[PDB]
Design an enzyme around this catalytic site. Structure first.
Site, PDB file in Angstrom:
ATOM      1  N   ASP A  94      18.644 -32.880 -21.044  1.00 50.55           N
ATOM      2  CA  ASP A  94      17.244 -32.479 -20.922  1.00 50.55           C
ATOM      3  C   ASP A  94      16.963 -31.918 -19.533  1.00 50.55           C
ATOM      4  O   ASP A  94      17.559 -32.346 -18.535  1.00 50.55           O
ATOM      5  CB  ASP A  94      16.303 -33.670 -21.168  1.00 50.55           C
ATOM      6  CG  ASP A  94      16.471 -34.283 -22.543  1.00 50.55           C
ATOM      7  OD1 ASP A  94      16.856 -33.555 -23.483  1.00 50.55           O
ATOM      8  OD2 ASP A  94      16.218 -35.504 -22.679  1.00 50.55           O
ATOM      9  N   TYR A 325      10.472 -30.201 -27.125  1.00 53.20           N
ATOM     10  CA  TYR A 325      10.730 -31.399 -26.336  1.00 53.20           C
ATOM     11  C   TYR A 325       9.470 -32.254 -26.206  1.00 53.20           C
ATOM     12  O   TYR A 325       8.372 -31.741 -25.961  1.00 53.20           O
ATOM     13  CB  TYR A 325      11.258 -30.982 -24.969  1.00 53.20           C
ATOM     14  CG  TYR A 325      11.733 -32.105 -24.086  1.00 53.20           C
ATOM     15  CD1 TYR A 325      12.804 -32.902 -24.464  1.00 53.20           C
ATOM     16  CD2 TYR A 325      11.132 -32.347 -22.861  1.00 53.20           C
ATOM     17  CE1 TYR A 325      13.262 -33.929 -23.652  1.00 53.20           C
ATOM     18  CE2 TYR A 325      11.583 -33.373 -22.033  1.00 53.20           C
ATOM     19  CZ  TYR A 325      12.656 -34.158 -22.432  1.00 53.20           C
ATOM     20  OH  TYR A 325      13.116 -35.179 -21.620  1.00 53.20           O
TER      21      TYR A 325
END
Length: 687
Positions: A94, A325
């Site tokens: 991420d 996300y």
């Protein structure tokens, strides 16, 4: 061949399906390194360093000792073996500071001698993954420094504060800085409820018929409440303070049962007159697309999901390519998403329900490296809810229901405004020689707009009207006669302030600046797991140990649970993440004291180390574990004692041959703190 590293197997399999031949995608199982967690974690080379077990060398600019978690040992060696057979390494964690730190630890641990590409993406689709592999981002050391600063802050805070909790409250309690602030929020509200005193106030509810002076009025009847008597406004619940005495505002008349009933008696027989009627149009704009805070709130209110459940589901949706996300403070939508949402809105609801222009919901995010977009369905074209319903059927049903929520919110955000009327009424009458004023309010929904696709759910404990609710009133004109169908003298009591739900705690953590997208649910999860807070229905209720710890921190270490000081530390961590503050300067100032920071903060007070190392032999542990409730009817204080076997009630009374002798009665979680009244206490003291 190319080796790609991500945090999870689901992500590993999903990226592999998109990258195709020539890539090996493996999972790190999250973090691979941490500070030492036990003495045995310290390697032989550092066992000669007295600071090694703490893991931080505060005398050498807070140098950390990172070791490989023994549970991750085989992961590292497997990763090391694969690196020997590839030409390139791709790090695909991420893009936020957590994922950047993991990539940094992978570099520090694997020490690659081949090209390294850092891939950043905020949805997992074949276009997004391909673009990310072809346009890598330079490693952002400011992000890594921000993540590391927080990790060391957490270590030092625990190092300094834990032994105070052990000596003064209970062993095996764990320190948690932000957790203790969220717990204070819950305790403060419960303390407000315990100190709340209700006031009584009466008015008159009238059912009024208009079909006598206008047989076309729709609805024929409606309700109205008495609001003035002889020019003095009638007291309502908002007019009393938390002790049940009138606020220092404009004058009011406080009606009681006999008072209000006499007004209704002098009235029935008569008719009422419309003194005033007003219509005011309103137009409601759609809700912004979800960010992490609002997703957790709405999933909690509408779906009854805990914050932790919501984020576990959102993580699965993300890693499986369904949504963008899920840790973000952005409500921005990209061009393709706005256009997909308008199209869906047009097909499902019609041209009239599409907003005339595209709607952008741009708010400033803390860090553009870490958040790029609202939480929305992934892909240039959104996966349809039906197709997602068939894939996430059976055991994956919660996943579908969260996807549906996200889809509906995204589509509603591109829809037209809702429209309606706000409706006001003044009604006058004569109860004997006193003029009375009755008031009624209304609201129509002429055109639902985006409300056809998404309506927020009202907080279960705060209550209120939904945004699509209607209160219809007939069309009236001044002077019009009205017949009284019914008069009911109506008694009321003020209510204590509502407890927090998980939804309103997230809201409070955001508005106070204490929570962040990556911490809201872990805060809320942790205060419940460590025993500070439990659920009664949807209400968060503090435990008695939560009172003891909160009082200790408040009375002797108050800066550490101050809301403003806490929010400012979170802001400073974000400044490190943006490269406007230095990790080392921040840690030195915070821990050792310095001239930087908000006035009177921990840093400016002399630092955490001096702050906690006051003389603790002056903190009485008996007082810490005694929560004062009230005195009994003889003037004797009753207090809850938090003991090794749990909570119990206690007072000192006169014994066999003179006083002071303790009288006790054991307690369970069954009785919430604001329910343990003197009446309840006396009953517990007898049986």
């Amino acid at each position: 061949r190319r080796l790609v590293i991500v945090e999870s197997p689901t992500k590993a399999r999903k990226l592999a399906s998109y990258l195709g031949s020539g890539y090996i995608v493996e999972s790190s199982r999250g973090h691979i390194r941490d500070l030492p967690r036990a003495a045995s974690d310290v390697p032989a080379k550092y066992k000669s360093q007295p600071w090694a077990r703490l893991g931080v060398n505060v005398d050498a600019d807070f140098e950390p000792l990172y070791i490989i978690s023994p549970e991750k040992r085989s992961t590292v060696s497997e990763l090391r073996g694969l690196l020997k057979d590839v030409d390139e390494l791709y790090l695909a964690t991420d893009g936020d500071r957590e994922g950047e730190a993991i990539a940094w630890h992978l570099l520090e641990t694997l020490k690659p001698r081949i090209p390294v590409k850092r891939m950043v993406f905020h949805e997992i689709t074949e276009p997004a993954i391909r673009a990310a592999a072809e346009h890598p981002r330079d490693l952002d050391i400011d992000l890594v420094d921000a993540q590391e600063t927080r990790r060391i802050l957490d270590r030092l805070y625990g190092y300094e504060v834990s032994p105070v909790l052990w000596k003064k409250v209970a062993p095996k309690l764990s320190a948690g800085r932000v957790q203790s602030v969220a717990t204070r929020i819950i305790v403060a509200r419960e303390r407000d409820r315990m100190a709340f005193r209700s006031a009584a106030y009466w008015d008159i509810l009238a059912k009024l018929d208009a079909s006598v002076s206008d047989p076309d009025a729709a609805p024929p009847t409606f309700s109205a409440r008495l609001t003035a008597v002889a020019g003095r406004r009638v007291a309502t619940g908002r007019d009393f303070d938390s002790l049940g005495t009138l606020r220092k505002g404009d004058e009011v008349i406080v009606l009681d049962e006999g008072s209000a009933t006499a007004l209704a008696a002098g009235l029935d027989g008569t008719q009422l007159t419309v003194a005033s009627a007003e219509e005011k149009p309103y137009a409601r704009r759609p809700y912004p697309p979800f960010m992490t805070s609002t997703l957790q709130q709405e999933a909690s209110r509408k779906l009854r999901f805990s914050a932790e459940r919501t984020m576990s589901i959102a993580q699965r949706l993300y890693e499986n390519g369904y949504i963008t996300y899920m840790r973000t403070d952005s409500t921005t939508l990209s061009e393709s998403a706005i256009n997909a949402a308008r199209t869906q809105a047009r097909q499902l609801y019609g041209d009239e329900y599409v907003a005339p222009a595209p709607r952008q919901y741009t708010r400033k995010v803390k860090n553009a490296q870490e958040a790029h977009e609202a939480i929305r369905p992934a892909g240039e074209t959104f996966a349809t809810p039906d197709a997602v319903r068939r894939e996430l059927d059976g055991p994956n049903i919660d996943d579908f229901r969260l996807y549906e929520l996200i889809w509906q919110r995204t589509v509603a955000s591109q829809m037209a405004d809702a429209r309606g009327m706000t409706l006001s009424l003044r009604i006058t009458g004569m109860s004997g020689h006193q003029e009375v004023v009755f008031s009624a309010t209304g609201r129509t929904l002429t055109f639902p707009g985006f409300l056809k696709a998404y309506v927020e759910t009202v907080d279960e404990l705060v209550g209120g009207e939904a945004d699509d609710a209607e209160r219809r009133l007939p069309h009236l004109t001044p002077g019009q006669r009205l017949d009284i169908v019914e008069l009911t003298p109506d008694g009321h009591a003020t209510n204590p302030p509502a407890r927090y739900t998980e939804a309103s705690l997230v809201k409070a953590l955001e508005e106070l600046g204490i929570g962040r997208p990556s911490t809201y649910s872990s805060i809320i999860k942790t205060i419940q797991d460590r025993g500070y807070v439990h659920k009664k229905g949807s209400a968060l209720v503090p435990s008695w140990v939560a009172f003891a710890v909160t009082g200790l921190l408040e009375q002797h270490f108050g800066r550490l649970v101050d809301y403003d000081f806490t929010a400012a530390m979170e802001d400073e961590l974000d400044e490190i993440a943006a490269g406007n503050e230095r990790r080392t300067n921040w840690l030195n100032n915070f821990y050792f004291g310095g001239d930087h920071g908000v006035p009177d903060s921990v840093a400016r007070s002399g630092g955490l180390k001096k702050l906690v190392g006051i003389n603790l032999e002056g903190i009485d542990a008996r007082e810490v574990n005694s929560i004062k409730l009230f005195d009994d009817t003889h003037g004797r204080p009753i207090y809850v004692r938090v003991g090794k076997n749990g909570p119990y009630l206690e007072r000192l009374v006169a014994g066999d041959t003179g006083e002071p002798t303790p009288q006790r009665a054991n307690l369970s979680d069954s009785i919430t703190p604001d329910e343990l009244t003197l009446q309840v206490a006396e009953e517990l003291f007898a049986t």
